[PDB]
Amino acid sequence: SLKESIERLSSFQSKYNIFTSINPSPYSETLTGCVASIKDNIVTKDFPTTCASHILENFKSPFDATVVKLLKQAGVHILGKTNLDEFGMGSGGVHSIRGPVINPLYPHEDKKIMGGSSSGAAASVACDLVDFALGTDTGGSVRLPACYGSVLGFKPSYGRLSRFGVIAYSQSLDTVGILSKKINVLRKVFHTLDKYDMKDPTSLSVELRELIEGNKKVRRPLKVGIVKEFSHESMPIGFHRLYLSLLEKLINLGLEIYPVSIPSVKNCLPIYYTLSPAEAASNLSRYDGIRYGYRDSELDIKDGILFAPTRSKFGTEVKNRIILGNYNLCSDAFKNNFIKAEKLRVNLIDEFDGIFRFPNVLTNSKGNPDGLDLLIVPTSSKLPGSIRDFEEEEAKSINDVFTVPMSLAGLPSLSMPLKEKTPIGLQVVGQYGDDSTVLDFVESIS
Amino acid sequence: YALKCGLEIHTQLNTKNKLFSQSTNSATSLVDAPNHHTSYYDIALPGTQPVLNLEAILFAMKLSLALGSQVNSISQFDRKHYFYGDQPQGYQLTQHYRPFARGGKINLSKELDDIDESAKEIGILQLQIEQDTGKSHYTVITLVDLNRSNVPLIELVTKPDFSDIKQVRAFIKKYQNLVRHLHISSGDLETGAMRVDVNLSINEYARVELKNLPNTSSIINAIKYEYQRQVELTSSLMEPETRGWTGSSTVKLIDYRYMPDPELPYINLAPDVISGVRGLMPQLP
Amino acid sequence: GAKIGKKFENMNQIRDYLSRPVWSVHEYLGEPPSAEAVKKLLRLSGLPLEGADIKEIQMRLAKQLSFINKLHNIPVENTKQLNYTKLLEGISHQKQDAELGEVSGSWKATGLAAESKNAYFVVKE
Numbered sequence: 001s002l003k004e005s006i007e008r009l010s011s012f013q014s015k016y017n018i019f020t021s022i023n024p025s026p027y028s029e030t031l032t033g034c035v036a037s038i039k040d041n042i043v044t045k046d047f048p049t050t051c052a053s054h055i056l057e058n059f060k061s062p063f064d065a066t067v068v069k070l071l072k073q074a075g076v077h078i079l080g081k082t083n084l085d086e087f088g089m090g091s092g093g094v095h096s097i098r099g100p101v102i103n104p105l106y107p108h109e110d111k112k113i114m115g116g117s118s119s120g121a122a123a124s125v126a127c128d129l130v131d132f133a134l135g136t137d138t139g140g141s142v143r144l145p146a147c148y149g150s151v152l153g154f155k156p157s158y159g160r161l162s163r164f165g166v167i168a169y170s171q172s173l174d175t176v177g178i179l180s181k182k183i184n185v186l187r188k189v190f191h192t193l194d195k196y197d198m199k200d201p202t203s204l205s206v207e208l209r210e211l212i213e214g215n216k217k218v219r220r221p222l223k224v225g226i227v228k229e230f231s232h233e234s235m236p237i238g239f240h241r242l243y244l245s246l247l248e249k250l251i252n253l254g255l256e257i258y259p260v261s262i263p264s265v266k267n268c269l270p271i272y273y274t275l276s277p278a279e280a281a282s283n284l285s286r287y288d289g290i291r292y293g294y295r296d297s298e299l300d301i302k303d304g305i306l307f308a309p310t311r312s313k314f315g316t317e318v319k320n321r322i323i324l325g326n327y328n329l330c331s332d333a334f335k336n337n338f339i340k341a342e343k344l345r346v347n348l349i350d351e352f353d354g355i356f357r358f359p360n361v362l363t364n365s366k367g368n369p370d371g372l373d374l375l376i377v378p379t380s381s382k383l384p385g386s387i388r389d390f391e392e393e394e395a396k397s398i399n400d401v402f403t404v405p406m407s408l409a410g411l412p413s414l415s416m417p418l419k420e421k422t423p424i425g426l427q428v429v430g431q432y433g434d435d436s437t438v439l440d441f442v443e444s445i446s
Numbered sequence: 447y448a449l450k451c452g453l454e455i456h457t458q459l460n461t462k463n464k465l466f467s468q469s470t471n472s473a474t475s476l477v478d479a480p481n482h483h484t485s486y487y488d489i490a491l492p493g494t495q496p497v498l499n500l501e502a503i504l505f506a507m508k509l510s511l512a513l514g515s516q517v518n519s520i521s522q523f524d525r526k527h528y529f530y531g532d533q534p535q536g537y538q539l540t541q542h543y544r545p546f547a548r549g550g551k552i553n554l555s556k557e558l559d560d561i562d563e564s565a566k567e568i569g570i571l572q573l574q575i576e577q578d579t580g581k582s583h584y585t586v587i588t589l590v591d592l593n594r595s596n597v598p599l600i601e602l603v604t605k606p607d608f609s610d611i612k613q614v615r616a617f618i619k620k621y622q623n624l625v626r627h628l629h630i631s632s633g634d635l636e637t638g639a640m641r642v643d644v645n646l647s648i649n650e651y652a653r654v655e656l657k658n659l660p661n662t663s664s665i666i667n668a669i670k671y672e673y674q675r676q677v678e679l680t681s682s683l684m685e686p687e688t689r690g691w692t693g694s695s696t697v698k699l700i701d702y703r704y705m706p707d708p709e710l711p712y713i714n715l716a717p718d719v720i721s722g723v724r725g726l727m728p729q730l731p
Numbered sequence: 732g733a734k735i736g737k738k739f740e741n742m743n744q745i746r747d748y749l750s751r752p753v754w755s756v757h758e759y760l761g762e763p764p765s766a767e768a769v770k771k772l773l774r775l776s777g778l779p780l781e782g783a784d785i786k787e788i789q790m791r792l793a794k795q796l797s798f799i800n801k802l803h804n805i806p807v808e809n810t811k812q813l814n815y816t817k818l819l820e821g822i823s824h825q826k827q828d829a830e831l832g833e834v835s836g837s838w839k840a841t842g843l844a845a846e847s848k849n850a851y852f853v854v855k856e
Contacts, residue, residue, distance in 0.1 A: 043493045056492065062838055063486060063830065065493060165493040172708040199831060201497050202709050207811075225735065226745070232755040240749070248742050259736035259748055266759050270801045279708055281776065282525055285536025286490045288777070290590070290852050292843040300855040306529040308779040322776045323788065324795050327764070329527070329703035330775075337799060338705075343807045350808070351733040364809065372735065397794065401756050468825060468833045480850040481840040486832040489840050494831075500821045503813075529777050531854035536777075586856035589848060592840070701775065714812045722815030 002027060009079075009129055015108040017101050018123045021047045022080035031188060032075035037124040037133040040081040041088050041167040042176075044068050047078075051167055052086045052096035054313035056293045065165025066197050067134060067176055074192050079130050082120025086315040088136055088169040089280065091144060091399045092390045093119025095317050100387050103148060105421055111387045115148035115380075115399075117141040118177065122149035125179045132180035132189055138169050139272055140379075140403025142177030143415040147379040147425035150417040152186055152442070154178045156435050158410030159204035162197035168283040170276040171202065173407050183443045190439065204433075211361050212433040222441065224250065225260035225355065225372040230402060233381040242418040243378070246426065249445070258372060260355055264348040265405040271348070272404045274328055274341035281325030284318070287311060349409050358431035362410075367431075374441060378402050379415040379425035402427065412438045416446075447648050447677055451608035451669065452571075454643040455621065457600050457631045458578065459505050464488070465577055465598035466496035466539065472593060473632075475581075480591035488596050490534035496710060502598045503713065505630040506546045506575055507723040509600060512628060512730060513570055515550030517720065521713040523575075526702045531590045532580030540576035540601075542704045546713070547573040552617060552624075559616040568617055569605035576601055600630075606645070611669055618642060618662055627728060635661050644669060648676045655688045656696065664691060672696050760801070763793035 005027050013019055020040045027035065043049045043061035050056050064072070071078070085095045093116035094100040101119035103112040104127045114123050118135025122145035125133050135142045137155040146153020154177055161176040168174065176193070180186040197203040226247075235243075251257060289295030289310035296309035314322070328338055353365035355372055379402055385393075406413040406427070412435040415425045430438040464471050469485040472478055487494040510517050521544045525537040550570035554561050578597035583589040602621070608614050622633035622640065632639045642665050645655040656672060659665045668691040675696065676683060689696045739745050764772075769788045773780055813821075827833035841847045 049492065051492075059492065060843070061491065061493070062832065062843075063491075163493075164495060167492045170708075199497070199828070200495055201711060202495075226739075226748070228753065229756065231749050232751075232753045233757060234755065244742060244746065247745060251739075251742065257739045257745070259739070261734045261736075263733065266756055267802070267805055269756075269760065270799045273795070274799045274802065278705065282527065282537065282703075282705055285527060285529070285777075286492075286534060288529065288536070289845060290531060290854060291489050291534060291841075292491065293845075295845040303774075303780040305774050305777060305779060307777045311777045312779050312782075314778075319776070319778060320791065322778070323769075323772050324792065326703065326772055326775045327792065327796070328799075329705055330701050331703075334703070334705075337802060340802050340805070340807070341799075344802065344805060347808055354733045355735055370735065398757065398760075463825065463827070463833075468827045468831065470827075470835050479836075481852070482850070483835045484832075484840040486838075489843075491843075499825065500813075500818060501825070504818065504822065527775075531852070582854075583851070587848070588854045588856065589851035590854060591851060703775070712810070714810055715818075716812035716814035718815045719813065719818055722818070 012104065012127045012129060015102070016104050016123055016127065017099055018082060018120045018127070018129070019080040020050055020052065020083050020098055020120070023078060026079055027077070029074045031071065031192060033077070034075070034131045034185065035077045035079050036071060037079050037082045037121060037130045038068060039084055039118050039121050039133070039135045041084060041136060042068060042134060043165040043167065044078070044081065047081045049081070049167070050097070051088070052084045052098060053315060053318070054097055054294055055287050057097065059293050061165070063165065066162035066199060067193050068165065070193055070195065082118070082124055082133065084119055085117035086318050087167070087284070088117045088138055088141060089318055089321055090116045091140065092116050092394070093145065094387055094391060095315055102387070103384055103423075105148070105150060105423055112384045113148070113387055113390050115145035115384065118145045118179070121179050122146050122151060122153070125149060125151045125181060131182070132178060132185050135177045135179060136166060136169070137175045137177040137407065138173045139276065139407045140400045142179060143379055143403050143413060143427060144399065146179045147415045148384045148423045150421050150423055151179055151181050152183060152417070153415040154186055154190065154439070155406070155413050156190060156194070157204070157412045157433050159202050160435065161193045162195070162200045162203055164197055164199040170279040171283065172279060173276060175407070183439070183446050187439050187443065190435070194435070208361050215359050215361070216436070219357070219373050221254050221256055222374065223256045223258060223357070223372045225258050225375045227265065227375055227377055228259060228261040229263065229265045230377045233378070233401070235378065235381050236383045236424060239378070239424055242424060243426070246418060253445075260372060260375070262351050262355065264344070264351045267344060268348065268405045268408055269398070269401060271341045271344050271408060272400070274337050275345070277321045277325035278328040278338060279325070281322045281329065284322055345408050348405065352409050352411065352431065356431035358434045360432050362432060373430070373437060375429040377427045377429060379427050384423050414438050414442055416442055449609050449646060449648055449673060450606040450650075451614065451644065451646040452606040453604045453608070453614070453617065454645065455602045456641040457602070457625055457633065458639045459502060459598040459600060460631055461499060461501040461505065461598055463499055463501075464596040465499055465502055465575070467596055468499070469596070471597055475593055478593055480593060483593045484595070488534070488592055496539065496707070498710065499598065502575055504723065506573065506600060507719065508628045508630060508727060509625070510547040510550065510573055511720070511724055511727060512624060513550030513552065513573070515547035515570060515573055517547045517715065518544055519714070520544060521546045523707045523710050525705045525707055528700065528702060530579070531588060532582045532592070532595065534580065534592060534595060538577050538579065539707060541574040543706065545572040545574045552620060554613060554616050554620070559620065561612055561616055562610060566613060568607045568613070571603040571605050574601040575599070611666055614669060615662065615666060618665070627730075646672060648673060651676070652683050653686045654683070656691060657688060657699065658690050664693070668696055763789040
């Protein structure tokens with residue numbers, strides 16, 4: 001079966017294009033013997049870290065990311081690095097120098113999208129190739145592919161898991177995420193990685209972690225909110241039957257369900273697409289071929305533009321983002337769009353604080369004793385389309401409407417399937433820092 | 447004619463280690479093998495992150511106190527974006543929007559400073575902590591050594607309070623003595639441990655800044671040249687213009703997209719840092 | 732502002748709530764920059780001008796900006812201090828971390844470069 005597991009690996013890899021590199025000896029403490037895949041924007045000593053980009057096509061890091069190191073210390077076997085949208089920019093899983101990842105919920109000839117940017121991560125779990133996968137979530141890049149693979153996809157509170165060694169897209173939004181079919185495995189991995197890291201200046205301090213722990217109370221019963229602003233999109237056929245079935249289950253378990261309005265979530269996409277490209281342009285400024293990565297064979301300058309020959313090897317979508325990001329950062333646009341987006345983001349966080357019972361230790365909100373413990377929100381409003389249709393539709397002119405708000409507010413959010421092998425999901429969302437409540441709830445109802 | 451002159455002085459701090467990495471801040475850069483005192487962060491490897499060296503805060507505190515500057519309740523680092531071989535991140539970290547301190551002054555007297563005026567105070571605009579860049583050697587290919595990249599600097603900007611050239615000389619001299627006395631820098635202009643830019647304007651005409659002045663002698667001469675040169679004029683000196691120096695004459699010479707760093711925490715010092723560091727100050731002259 | 736309603740009493744109340752006349756986010760969300768602006772942007776982005784489709788960039792950027800400029804019409808609505816002992820304690824506990832490559836000569840800093848000259852990085856004029 002060791003030889004049979006390897007044959008399955010080879011077959012799914014050739015059909016679905018899941019990994020960018022695989023352990024030379026595939027399948028050979030607390031997580032001893034567990035098998036993981038790692039998104040290829042997370043650096044490793046033992047594999048190249050390409051970001052699915054020509055820019056880092058054969059990049060070899062001298063060091064492991066903190067999350068990689070913690071998993072190895074816990075005895076986890078790393079099966080390989082998974083394919084992704086280039087530099088984590090994309091929601092369909094189609095932008096990669098290795099080509100798109102194909103969704104294994106369907107025959108590979110169907111060419112259905114996996115979603116992105118943690119496309120390979122989700123596929124590797126959906127295929128039963130690994131016990132769990134690490135991905136990254138900047139605006140839904142863990143939750144959305146997990147939804148499309150019909151597996152659990154958890155994006156923890158901002159700063160809980162270390163970003164040291166996690167190649168930057170948008171640092172105020174980037175979060176390491178976990179994908180798995182088994183909630184018990186996912187909780188164990190989260191517990192292993194939920195650690196303060198002194199190498200990461202955005203890592204949640206030990207003091208604040210203890211403050212959070214100390215704020216937990218008995219909730220009798222749990223109070224769950226249904227968000228008005230997320231309750232009126234056109235949803236896939238069959239979604240509401242599944243959704244209402246889940247809601248009825250909760251109500252029969254004695255939970256209290258409430259309608260809730262959080263008006264600021266409607267403006268989250270314009271905010272996101274102001275701040276995120278700006279940070280991306282900034283974080284990709286380092287790539288020039290001089291110290292590492294791909295380098296043009298003859299020219300370090302062209303058109304009076306330094307490093308342009310090398311930087312032309314960025315993907316088209318990456319370049320689109322860099323250009324928009326630089327626009328947003330220029331003096332006039334900065335004082336207008338960027339500053340406004342920052343204030344609206346703060347507003348959004350205040351609106352969440354106002355409806356959650358749990359105090360926000362980052363804003364020092366008191367918590368609302370008449371508030372809620374969890375929100376339940378759809379993960380997506382679309383079924384996975386074909387790769388062809390996606391690219392066609394992208395060239396014309398939102399799949400992150402449901403996921404972006406929790407990213408902007410750094411909230412713990414787990415996308416869970418409603419039905420086996422069905423690319424439809426729900427997010428369970430808690431207040432900042434309330435990861436254990438989200439996870440235990442999901443464990444309780446599975 | 448009235449000279450309105452100001453100085454911008456960059457000073458390398460002699461902290462043991464660098465500004466946003468704990469790699470060595472070397473005092474022997476000229477003999478060191480290139481790219482030897484460089485962390486993963488100094489080389490801007492994918493996934494690396496800045497962590498502030500608190501010794502730079504202490505050093506900046508001592509200077510602010512000595513000058514009587516007001517330490518900002520909140521300061522922060524911002525990214526100044528541009529491409530260059532000696533700038534591995536593609537931006538420099540510096541305190542653009544919220545400097546470490548503001549105000550302060552340095553007193554000059556005829557009695558002690560060989561000044562024509564019995565007493566003359568030079569006001570300080572602000573005090574900023576920022577990253578140094580690497581070193582480039584042009585041989586056409588240019589050689590880059592990142593040993594000096596991420597070395598801590600403090601930039602001091604004075605108000606345009608300089609009227610005489612004797613004032614400029616006396617200030618630089620005393621400022622050098624001060625940083626050495628506080629043990630925060632060697633203050634050496636010869637090694638580049640201290641670098642002086644000048645901005646000036648005669649009789650409320652357009653502001654001109656003189657760059658690339660290697661020693662005190664060259665600063666004094668560029669100022670004297672630029673003063674007389676401007677006097678002779680006058681449509682060309684209507685808008686601001688940055689000039690250089692060539693030993694004989696002064697010759698003529700980008701949106702940086704300043705963004706507050708999204709990773710680094712604000713500098714938020716408690717009041718007891720002020721009184722605490724005050725007690726550790728040496729006797730001042 | 733945010734608001735919480737009364738607890739749902741039964742599943743049909745939820746079905747009615749989910750059926751209310753309320754616009755979707757899609758329904759809520761519904762002069763390009765000059766060619767000289769795009770060329771400026773390409774330069775700041777360190778991207779080549781040669782081969783760049785200027786009009787196409789103008790169009791795409793125009794659409795992008797019209798989307799994010801929706802923020803133009805949206806109106807708008809005490810942290811952990813570092814003290815003296817922590818300042819001095821933080822300083823005293825600062826050290827070079829092998830896992831960060833902070834010890835001088837602990838790794839080959841030019842080792843990952845496609846090109847170099849001895850121990851220097853190189854840039855071509």
